[PDB]
Amino acid sequence: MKWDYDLRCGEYTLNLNEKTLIMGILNVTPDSFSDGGSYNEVDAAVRHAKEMRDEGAHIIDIGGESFAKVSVEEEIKRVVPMIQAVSKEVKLPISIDTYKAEVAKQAIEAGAHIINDIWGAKAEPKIAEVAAHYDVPIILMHNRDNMNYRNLMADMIADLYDSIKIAKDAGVRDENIILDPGIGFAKTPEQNLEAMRNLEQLNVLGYPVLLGTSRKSFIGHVLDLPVEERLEGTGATVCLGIEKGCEFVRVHDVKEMSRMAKMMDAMIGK
Amino acid sequence: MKWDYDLRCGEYTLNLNEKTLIMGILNVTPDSFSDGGSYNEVDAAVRHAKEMRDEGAHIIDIGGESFAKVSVEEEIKRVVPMIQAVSKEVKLPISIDTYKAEVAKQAIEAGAHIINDIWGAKAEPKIAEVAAHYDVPIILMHNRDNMNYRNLMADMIADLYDSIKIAKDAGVRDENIILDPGIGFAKTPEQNLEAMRNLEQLNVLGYPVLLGTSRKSFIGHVLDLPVEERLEGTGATVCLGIEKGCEFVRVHDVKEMSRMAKMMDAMIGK
Numbered sequence: 182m183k184w185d186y187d188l189r190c191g192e193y194t195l196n197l198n199e200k201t202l203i204m205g206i207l208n209v210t211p212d213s214f215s216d217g218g219s220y221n222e223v224d225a226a227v228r229h230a231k232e233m234r235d236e237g238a239h240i241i242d243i244g245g246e247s248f249a250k251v252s253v254e255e256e257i258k259r260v261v262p263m264i265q266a267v268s269k270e271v272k273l274p275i276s277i278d279t280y281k282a283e284v285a286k287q288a289i290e291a292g293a294h295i296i297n298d299i300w301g302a303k304a305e306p307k308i309a310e311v312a313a314h315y316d317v318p319i320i321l322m323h324n325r326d327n328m329n330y331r332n333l334m335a336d337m338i339a340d341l342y343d344s345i346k347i348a349k350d351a352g353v354r355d356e357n358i359i360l361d362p363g364i365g366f367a368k369t370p371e372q373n374l375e376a377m378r379n380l381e382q383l384n385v386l387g388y389p390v391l392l393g394t395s396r397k398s399f400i401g402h403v404l405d406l407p408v409e410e411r412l413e414g415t416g417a418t419v420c421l422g423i424e425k426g427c428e429f430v431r432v433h434d435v436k437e438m439s440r441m442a443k444m445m446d447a448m449i450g451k
Numbered sequence: 452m453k454w455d456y457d458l459r460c461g462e463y464t465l466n467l468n469e470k471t472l473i474m475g476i477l478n479v480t481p482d483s484f485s486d487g488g489s490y491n492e493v494d495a496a497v498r499h500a501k502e503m504r505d506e507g508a509h510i511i512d513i514g515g516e517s518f519a520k521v522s523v524e525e526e527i528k529r530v531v532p533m534i535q536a537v538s539k540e541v542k543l544p545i546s547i548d549t550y551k552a553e554v555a556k557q558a559i560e561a562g563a564h565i566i567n568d569i570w571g572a573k574a575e576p577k578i579a580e581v582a583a584h585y586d587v588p589i590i591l592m593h594n595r596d597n598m599n600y601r602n603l604m605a606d607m608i609a610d611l612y613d614s615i616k617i618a619k620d621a622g623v624r625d626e627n628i629i630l631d632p633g634i635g636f637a638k639t640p641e642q643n644l645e646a647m648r649n650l651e652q653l654n655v656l657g658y659p660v661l662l663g664t665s666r667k668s669f670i671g672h673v674l675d676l677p678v679e680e681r682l683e684g685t686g687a688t689v690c691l692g693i694e695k696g697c698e699f700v701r702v703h704d705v706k707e708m709s710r711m712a713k714m715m716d717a718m719i720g721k
């Protein structure tokens with residue numbers, strides 16, 4: 182009905198109309214005495230991806246940087262072994278959480294299916310050329326180095342559009358474009374609540390929307406509850422986001438949010 | 452802004468615009484060897500009402516019947532001691548969950564502030580005369596002895612309206628009228644999801660709306676999860692309901708739903 186195509190992720194396909202797709206956030210704790218690839222840290226990633234697969238995750242999101250400061254070179258050595266292990270061992274598409282072109286390239290060559298850019302191709306535009314060449318889905322998230330909005334939503338849609346132009350000029354197909362309001366980036370707590378309240382506006386751009394609100398500090402600001410007490414707050418934002426038409430949510434609490442998403446879907450008629 | 456009055460509950464007042472008001476469901480386990488008023492069962496009610504007061508409840512809902520079969524006379528002897536204890540010991544308005552006129556009368560004379568009728572004044576119309584005389588708020592819930600809908604929402608609004616006419620003919624003031632779509636009553640699981648999806652229609656009638664979905668079996672039907680596993684499902688329905696404009700939610704999990712309601716409120720701008 183609403184999407185006339187599926188997200189093609191190489192060996193896996195995501196239907197955009199069936200259900201809200203849960204992206205599970207891989208927790209990625211490095212080893213303190215290693216250069217990446219070590220058995221403790223790879224095995225904890227795989228076990229965690231398996232747990233999230235079993236809890237209802239549709240996508241595993243994997244990042245090079247969320248303890249120790251790393252170079253691009255060191256970010257590659259962490260993330261590449263984990264992508265190879267998770268993709269061998271867990272049958273779910275993987276997104277590689279990076280804004281760097283070379284990191285994105287290796288992550289796909291190592292098995293990643295979707296690029297997840299927090300800089301919307303703006304930090305490193307060549308990443309869109311990476312997405313264009315491998316023919317992968319790429320998430321362009323709203324971000325900026327300031328909070329000088331004239332009008333938050335208007336500006337956010339303008340900024341997303343500048344990202345889409347970079348992606349398309351680089352030969353990215355419309356079907357590989359997912360957008361994200363980048364909640365928690367370049368935004369006051371009041372702007373975050375404003376974006377949530379007005380999220381349906383993003384639908385005019387014609388692309389699927391991913392929302393990432395999980396455990397973020399605007400929830401803490403409303404509830405006055407620390408990061409480990411943010412499950413109900415996150416739930417509310419997942420529910421509002423599915424009701425405003427988002428196709429994906431990016432969450433830590435996969436069991437719980439799958440359940441809320443499934444109920445939300447049944448009620449709104451998706 | 453949306454309500455130009457507050458709910459007057461005798462000594463307590465509820466602002467309809469500030470926040471979603473949480474009604475907490477008193478669990479009411481009778482003593483098996485007693486005629487009501489016993490210390491084990493009164494003390495467990497008070498302790499539970501105190502716990503819910505502390506978790507964010509705005510209203511305590513108290514029912515005469517939810518183990519052993521009771522007469523009207525026996526329903527009065529259970530509920531009246533608990534209302535006296537809870538109202539002495541917990542500073543929150545109490546709603547008396549009954550459809551019977553005489554039960555409602557004693558419950559108010561014993562300290563209850565709001566009448567909560569699952570039969571919308573239809574089982575015992577004289578209850579509206581009770582509400583009219585004591586000048587209490589009365590909740591008229593959608594119910595019927597069949598599921599022969601021509602058109603669910605149209606019919607539900609027609610039926611609510613027949614309840615409002617009984618309440619008003621009896622001298623109930625518009626400001627003491629709260630409505631409820633009676634989710635889980637006279638409705639298939641698919642009709643329940645249909646009512647949830649179309650809940651905002653109830654707003655045309657001009658009264659505040661209370662939603663009661665907590666742990667109900669339509670959640671179980673969607674999620675295939677038993678009553679103790681319905682917290683995330685309930686959460687979704689509370690979130691959708693606040694987003695569709697409900698003023699009250701009636702819940703068992705008061706801590707959790709207060710948190711979701713508070714986050715929902717911050718996002719929608721209530």
Ligand SMILES: CN1CC(CC(C)(C)O)=Nc2c1nc(N)[nH]c2=O
Pocket residue numbers: 244247278297298299320322361363364365391392393394397431
């Ligand atoms: C890659 N990230 C990181 C992030 C922040 C924390 C660290 C709080 O999870 N948020 C997001 C993200 N990626 C996308 N696409 N959307 C997010 O909201």
Ligand SMILES: CN1CC(CC(C)(C)O)=Nc2c1nc(N)[nH]c2=O
Pocket residue numbers: 514517548567568569590592631633634635661662663664667701
């Ligand atoms: C008084 N009740 C009982 C009830 C069912 C269970 C037993 C599942 O909680 N639901 C409701 C109720 N009262 C109101 N106003 N609204 C309800 O949804």
